[PDB]
Design a protein around this nucleic acid. Sequence first.
RNA 1: CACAAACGCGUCUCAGAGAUAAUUAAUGAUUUAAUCUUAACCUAAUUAACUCAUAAUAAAUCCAGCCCUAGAACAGGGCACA
Length: 292
Amino acid sequence: XXXXXXXXXXXXXXXXXXXXXXXXXXXXXXXXHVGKTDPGTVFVMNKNISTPYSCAMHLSEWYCRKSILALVDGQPWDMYKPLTKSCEIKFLTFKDDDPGEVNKAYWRSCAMMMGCVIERAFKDEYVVSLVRAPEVPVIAGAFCYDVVLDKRLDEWMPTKENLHSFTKDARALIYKDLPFETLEVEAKVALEIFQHNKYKLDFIEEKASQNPERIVKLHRFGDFIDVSEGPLIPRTSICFQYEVSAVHNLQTQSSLVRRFQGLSLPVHLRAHFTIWNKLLERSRKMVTEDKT
RNA sequence: CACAAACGCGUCUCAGAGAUAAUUAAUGAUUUAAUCUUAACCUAAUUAACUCAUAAUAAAUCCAGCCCUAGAACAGGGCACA
């Protein structure tokens, strides 16, 4: 499973390098960024596939480190979202009155993150087998990560120490400080990469083919790749803590589905350890609910 | 005593025990048939110091900010954070 993951990561890196090469082949472009977040700001630079986060860096280190999301021409985008021609750049943060976008992005980042973690733990033991299902976001403050496993994992029970170890590895990758990557790829090469995952194949085939856009955004964290229609968390330093609350088993059309669920911590801030235990209980209860 | 504080002039408390002092008082008893608290040896009893069966001590790893009978700073305490 290590050779297949290394070959898939090498094929994804070659496809990302080829797409990036063919898209950035012309390095002559005009990027004008003008808008008022704080009072007015006017800047003009020449680059292709320009990053608004680099403009945040251009302003100062403070607004840079406090940058979470980027509102462009009224449309909310990730800070890694490339800009072209004239654009109006606004900096959206958690403390702002509109938590929704950064919240959704946060939950989708947490789902992805564990998408990597579980896989890495499953790369520790060759006995286990993992197949990723689609993820279900919940605006109630929940996120559900769906997956299916080998029969051996169906026979063997998920002891508490296990999930604790998953949490430890999650925090490990959290303080490892690994930057997220944003790739623009065709549905074809993507289909080829996701061939080993049936649910993702069905996802792309059914949903993405109906969509007029053949350009899909692949978010890469470590050796893990995920499909996202929306913004991602800026860095690994943004997420202070993570926890694994509980799992569920659903039976549909004579098929079994294993759904893992947990919670996340915004703006690197926790009130106390008591309210943390309370957050554990709340987490598990929200897992028992399984909102849809 | 002109705030709810600090004081005595006011009130309360003060304890075993073990061992040895230098004197001094002995038991069976040699060397030296007697005698002898001593040479040996089991052993009876004797100020303060010299010591404790013990009483005070130590859960670091956030503490912004607001307060305190706490306070030079610091330290200590208390305030139902985002």
